Amino acid sequence: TLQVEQALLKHGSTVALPYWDWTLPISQLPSLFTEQTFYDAWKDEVLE
Amino acid sequence: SLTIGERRSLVLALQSLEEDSSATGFQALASFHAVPPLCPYPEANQRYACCVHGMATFPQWHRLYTVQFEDALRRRGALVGIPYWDTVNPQNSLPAFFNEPIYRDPVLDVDIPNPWAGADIAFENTTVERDFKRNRLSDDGEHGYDNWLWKQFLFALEQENYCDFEVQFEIAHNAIHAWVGGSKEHSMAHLHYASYDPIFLLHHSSTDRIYALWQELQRLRGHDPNEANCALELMREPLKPFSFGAPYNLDPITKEYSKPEDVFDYKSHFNYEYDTLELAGINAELLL
Amino acid sequence: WTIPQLEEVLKRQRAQDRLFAGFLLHNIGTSADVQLFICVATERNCNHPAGSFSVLGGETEMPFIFDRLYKYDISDPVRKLGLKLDSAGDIDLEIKIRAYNGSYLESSVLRRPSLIFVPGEDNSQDQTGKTERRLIRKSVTSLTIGERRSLVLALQSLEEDSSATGFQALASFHAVPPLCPYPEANQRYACCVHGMATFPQWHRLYTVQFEDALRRRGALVGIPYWDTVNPQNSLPAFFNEPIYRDPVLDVDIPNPWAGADIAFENTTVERDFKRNRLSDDGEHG
Amino acid sequence: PFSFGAPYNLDPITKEYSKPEDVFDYKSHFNYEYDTLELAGINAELLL
Amino acid sequence: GARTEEASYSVSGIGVRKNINTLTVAETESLKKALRAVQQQSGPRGYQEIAAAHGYPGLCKDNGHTVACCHHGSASFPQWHRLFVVTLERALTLQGARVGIPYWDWTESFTSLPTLLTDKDDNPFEHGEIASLNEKTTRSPRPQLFSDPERGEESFFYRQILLAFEQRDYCNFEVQYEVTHNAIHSWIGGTSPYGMSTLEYSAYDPIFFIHHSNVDRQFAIWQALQRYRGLDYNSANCNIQELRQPLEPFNWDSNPNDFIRENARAVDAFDYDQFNYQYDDLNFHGLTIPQLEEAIEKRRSEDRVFANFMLQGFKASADVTFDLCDADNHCSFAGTFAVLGGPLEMDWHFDRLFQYDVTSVFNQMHLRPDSVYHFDVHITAING
Amino acid sequence: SLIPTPSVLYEPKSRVTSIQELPPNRVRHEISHLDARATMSLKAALRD
């Protein structure tokens, strides 16, 4: 796990990867993974 | 007077910002300041830039811009706010902190190309070039400290009225721009390429510091440090593009201080403060 | 009204605050008028006028541009409409141009109007009653020409004095001649407290004793401090060059900070700068 | 020798402060301050 | 020797009328000392004789009756008191006052008297003495002054003002405005006959002048909103023949001021441009003229019921209450008001009717006007 | 022609009295108010 945060920081990450919890009542997979496409508003394109 | 640790923090933060390509990156900041122009109303056919130049809102807009930069940098991780470069004193030679393209990291026992030396523009893939005139630095005057802009700032720092301050404040602000841009248009001398230059930050920090000095310069004379009476027709609207929310003005603090009136109470609204409210090795308490 | 009783009327008029509108204007070709409208939010509509004035113009007229702004009063219509006197952010003015022959001109021919509010002269005193005298100390690396010259001249003036409050006499407290605990006792020694629990107190009272005297002697700022915790690859030149060149008089003076000599023993003191490891770096910078 | 008065010591402002027990609140007894109580670019909380 | 080169005491470019809370120490003390000085000294600026126009001994004659014919129920009410307050302001600024008298609005939910009346040492506002009959006037506040049962903690007079501003024509404003003018006088006078509920003792208290300043302010509000709505805003189209007579005693030869003498008429009184007095911020609860129109619109867009009256004078002062009792005789309070009167007045008359909104009681008690019900009206004197 | 022709302005005298601030030397105190320190310093700095 340690081997990746420094790599992301070098590749320009403002925050490190957080953890996934299930202690609270879990119903569906969290939304950060559900979507597949967004709009940049910087190149009039999309990105998966 | 910055220390080695502060230099390391600043250099790592700038190296970080000059590599990502998110909505909070160096290219993004260039976009906010200048071309591509998406102001004031993006869906309008006419294209305009948000760099309000030639009115009373120039100091407020640039102060809020520096506030956004400070928040981004401290999120990146730094121990001090972005320092200011003062040019009022006649420097013998240009400081090497950003002049030297190679910065020695002692903690990692290595060397890194300094990101403060310059940068490159995204949508043209050409590197912005840095020009200098050591003659301008040598310009001192008969008394040495009576430099070319010394008299100008002195003449600026006594106008009791507010709206007659900016009229020479702007010319003072663009004086350094001319003194550093050089012949090339792809440099500090042109509006379209201003956030591609790191020294932009230093100079505008110095300008904000001078404005802060005036904040109590007028206060000693006993008036309102947050008065914009003679600009009501222009203060009615929030500053662009900071009036927007997503996806550009991502920072909630900037979003909720997007108003131009409340930006004056900076000492208690942004927890950042210049250590020496001072001009050229002498404090204003006898400049009065 | 004759001369000696309208001045107080004018003062009374200026006493209260008023609203205003600012114009900039030049030759347009033919004399015409201007029209003011107060566009107020509900959307927004613009029908009620505030006031008007005119400009003079003819095809034979000399082209000209004015220098300073022109002031007009809209206080009466603004107050009658009854919005906020001072917080007038939402009021927006509208410009209409009426020609002499009944024609109109697009408002873009003239510059966009501004709006200005001025407070009344109810203010009596403005200047601060009194300031506060506090000294502030800064590092040796952050000095400028003015105060640096001030400090160097103050020190060179103090050094060559031979009075009771002279540099030699003041610095004689530390060591020879011994004056402690008191000359009356047949035993004489110095009392530079060392190893005891009053070390900081003694060495701070000593520094303040120099500092206040030198400030009276003509320094605008407190004594600079040569912090040594950080590395020093090359020591500052502030205390290296014997000759300091004043910018004002273009004169060369032996810098007191560079060196000094002992009075009652008349033997020059040198400085042993062992550069072997005074420029330490360690193994983590 | 600061306990001694004239002619050994001339200034009066330290005579009333010759007591070592009350020379700690310099902010109120000597009206001289620092730019910042920093240490090699490190402030109080970080140094702590 | 030296020359003074002073005086000539020009009275022109009259200043502003600020609120009670917008005053500072110097202006407050100047106003109070000026009021005390003009109350003491006699003459053209004589406060006592200038105030004698509302009471003892009376200075007007009608059909062998000696009265103080200050119009107090006819159709020329506002302008008489406007000129009265203008005369007082001119007199006080002639001797060297600072600004015009302030106005103490009541439409806020104030729970007590303002700070001006709470002072104790050498403040003329606290008491009034008349040498003609040698006694001290007294104030009698009542608990209902700070309590409003019809709607709640909102000010009582807000409903009256909103039901006064909807209409357009002029001579249907006084009918709903004089009641509000006199009810406050009656309440502040209270049980003590030596106060403001009466007429002879109602002129030697600065509270009277403050109240009249406020009512002039609200009249100006009405004028401004009418101007915005786009109707007549300098005259009236009804009952002309009483709007031409001289506004006595201001047309006597005992008028120290000159300007009001020639234009002491009715029609020319509708414009205060020449009188030189002006207000600072005539906003209403911070709600401005671009807001009052739709506030009134949303108030009047619904169904309401009105308990209309035809008021008349009886040469006496007493409060009025009315109670609603249904078929089962469940008597309950619905509203109340007052009326102005005294032994030293003439028998006035209201040209038009009087209105009062009573929708709340009907809507709460399901008393739609198809049922049978009645109102009992009690005329309670100041001594019960 | 792209810039308007300029004019000249004359900022006049300002006869208001000002209280200048100077170090507590080159300021002429009164003789009686002088203290022992000042007297000794003056006499030494003259006899020198």
Ligand SMILES: *[C@@H]1O[C@H](CO)[C@@H](O[C@@H]2O[C@H](CO)[C@@H](O)[C@H](O)[C@H]2NC(C)=O)[C@H](O)[C@H]1NC(C)=O
């Ligand atoms: C009112 O006067 C203006 C000013 O002369 C007229 O505008 C000019 O019109 C002539 C011909 O009509 C043109 O050649 C000029 O170029 C116009 N100049 C400007 C500044 O507008 C206008 O035409 C007149 N009104 C009418 C109805 O003719």
Ligand SMILES: *[C@@H]1O[C@H](CO)[C@@H](O[C@@H]2O[C@H](CO)[C@@H](O)[C@H](O)[C@H]2NC(C)=O)[C@H](O)[C@H]1NC(C)=O
């Ligand atoms: C006290 O109550 C009496 C009873 O109503 C009031 O007397 C009225 O007013 C005058 C006073 O003498 C007379 O016309 C009659 O006695 C009563 N008239 C009416 C129409 O009721 C008396 O005025 C009250 N006291 C005060 C100070 O008003």
